[PDB]
């Protein structure tokens, strides 16, 4: 219908006319990115009338229609400043059963209003900072956490579950105090690991790689985003024994799904979310990755399993080709790989025997080629301070943390990754590697490594002291604070 016609009908109040008009309007118009100005004034007045009738108790009949109309209204910025009042947010919350009135237990399963109110909440919080700072004071996180906890004792539909998970993700990502409130006061990590084990339960005990359905993959990715947002703080090094146990539990839950695949093409997104959550886990917990029961046909190395390490290495391989958002893609992978390789000799030897082994190449610059070694040493010269440092640390821990063995490839990588403190790593000097190259090690200038081009000095003593005028050129920059 027309916005002006609906707005004019909103003043009459005919029960069997205005509701049919709203229904026809929702049936006709139901897609985002509407008009600009022909809807600006009239639909702004319509949204004012709607928020006024929403600040009062609205009609119990056709509640889904009211919420659908308000949801469609909440997609244009012109009305977000109107719907983001504390009264309107509390009304949409109590309609979504996520308000502060925790006394009404989730007994009525009237989902038609629940899912629409959750959609409205998501729409408002994702694009209205005032709505964020209002929901942070109304404390909607507690009831959402209670609902997520009551997922086994009461089976909720997929849509409501996914939409409240998305609402929780938006709320914990945008508001800062919500993160701490859900971390300490709500035991968010435990509840989210519970929800993750609940999602990863489709045909349980699948010994090979388990395939995840669409809905399960979606909800798992959402709860992984929530965990990443809630965990990255105050988990640097020191934690309690029970917290370390819970973190090892979450690490096993993520290990059992990194090797797994999802339906469609969301495999890479799910794996990236798993790696992002892995990055936040404490260092000493990551040892639960390499520890796995060596089954039949599994990747064996040093008498221990390496399927998950090889899986995340191939994930780094497939992920390095996203050159745009490269700072968010491979840096957590490199971080978790370093931290699970620094603590274990089998992982260290595996990475040294699968990342930078080949030394008998035709003597050329290592910063060229198709190898993973060549790609990493090319990345070492990047313009992002977050990715060159982590790659430097990776190639450092791979060379058993040895500077003379670090200059294995270049002499500038040391210049890139030196003086980067936060050192009792495992030092090993047992195996020695020599090929036809290291007999020619005498002809390899160290920063450039093995180019064997020699040129003479050209001043010839006629003007060496005159060539020193460049010293007078450069001396003007040495003195710093005062001439004096």
């Amino acid at each position: 219908m027309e916005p002006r016609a609906v707005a004019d009908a909103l003043e009459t109040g005919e029960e069997d006319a205005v509701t049919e008009a709203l229904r026809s309007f929702n049936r006709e118009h139901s897609q985002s990115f509407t008009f600009d100005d022909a809807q600006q004034e009239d639909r702004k007045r319509l949204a004012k009338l709607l928020v006024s009738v929403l600040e009062q108790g609205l009609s119990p009949k056709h509640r889904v229609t009211w919420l659908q109309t308000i949801r469609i209204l909440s997609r244009d910025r012109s009305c977000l400043d109107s719907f983001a009042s504390r009264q309107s947010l509390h009304a949409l919350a109590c309609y979504a059963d996520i308000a502060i009135s925790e006394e009404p237990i989730p007994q009525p399963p009237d989902m038609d209003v629940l899912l629409e109110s959750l959609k409205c909440l998501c729409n408002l919080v994702l694009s209205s900072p005032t709505a964020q700072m209002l929901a942070a004071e109304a404390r909607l996180v507690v009831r959402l956490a209670e609902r997520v906890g009551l997922y086994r004792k009461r089976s909720y539909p997929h849509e409501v579950q996914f939409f409240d998970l998305r609402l929780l993700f938006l709320l914990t990502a945008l508001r800062t105090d919500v993160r701490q409130q859900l971390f300490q006061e709500l035991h968010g990590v435990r509840l989210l690991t519970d929800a993750l084990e609940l999602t990863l339960g489709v045909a349980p005990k699948e010994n090979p790689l388990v395939i995840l359905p669409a809905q399960e993959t979606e909800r798992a990715m959402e709860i992984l985003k929530v965990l990443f947002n809630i965990t990255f703080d105050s988990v640097k090094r020191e934690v309690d024994e029970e917290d370390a146990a819970l973190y090892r539990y979450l690490g096993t839950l993520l290990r059992h799904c990194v090797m797994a695949d999802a339906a469609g093409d969301r495999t890479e997104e799910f794996h990236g979310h798993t790696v992002n959550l892995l990055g936040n886990l404490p260092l000493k917990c990551l040892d639960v990755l390499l520890a796995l029961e060596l089954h039949e046909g599994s990747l064996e190395f040093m008498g221990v399993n390496m399927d998950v390490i090889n899986a995340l290495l191939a994930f780094l391989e497939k992920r390095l080709h996203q050159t745009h958002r490269l700072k968010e893609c491979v840096a957590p992978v490199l971080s978790v790989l370093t931290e699970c390789a620094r603590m274990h000799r089998p992982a260290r030897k595996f990475l040294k025997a699968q990342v930078l082994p080949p030394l008998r190449d035709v003597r050329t610059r290592p910063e060229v080629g198709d190898l993973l070694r060549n790609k990493l040493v090319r990345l070492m010269t990047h313009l992002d301070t977050d990715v060159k440092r982590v790659a430097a640390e990776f190639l450092f821990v791979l060379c058993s943390e040895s500077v003379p063995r670090f200059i294995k490839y270049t002499g500038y990588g040391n210049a890139a990754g030196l003086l980067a403190a936060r050192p009792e790593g495992q030092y090993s000097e047992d195996e020695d590697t020599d090929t036809e190259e290291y007999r020619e090690a005498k002809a390899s200038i160290n920063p450039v490594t093995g180019r064997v081009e020699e040129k003479p000095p050209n001043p010839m003593e006629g003007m060496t002291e005159e060539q020193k005028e460049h010293e007078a050129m450069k001396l003007v920059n040495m003195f710093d604070k005062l001439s004096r």
Partner: nanobody
Amino acid sequence: QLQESGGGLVQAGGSLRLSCAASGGIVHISSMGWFRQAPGKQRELVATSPSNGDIRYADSVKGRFTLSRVSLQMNSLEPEDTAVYYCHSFSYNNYYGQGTQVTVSS
């Protein structure tokens, strides 16, 4: 992608014609309108044709600014509202374009 044609050089309640050319290839636009930007404020609504009921004018000026297929006829002008005009219509979105200005005096 859209273009409009029509000038403004009247100082005392004249009659003008402004045309908006359907230059784009996308169909189902269902609406076409015009605007005006005063040199002191932003844009203001003039008239739109929603093609789903009656034509809608603006409460700002209730003159006989006739609009049809589009083409906007400005009758009973009274040019105390000199401004820069623009056309309007509407992978779904809406477009403005560029437009002419009217110089009024006396």
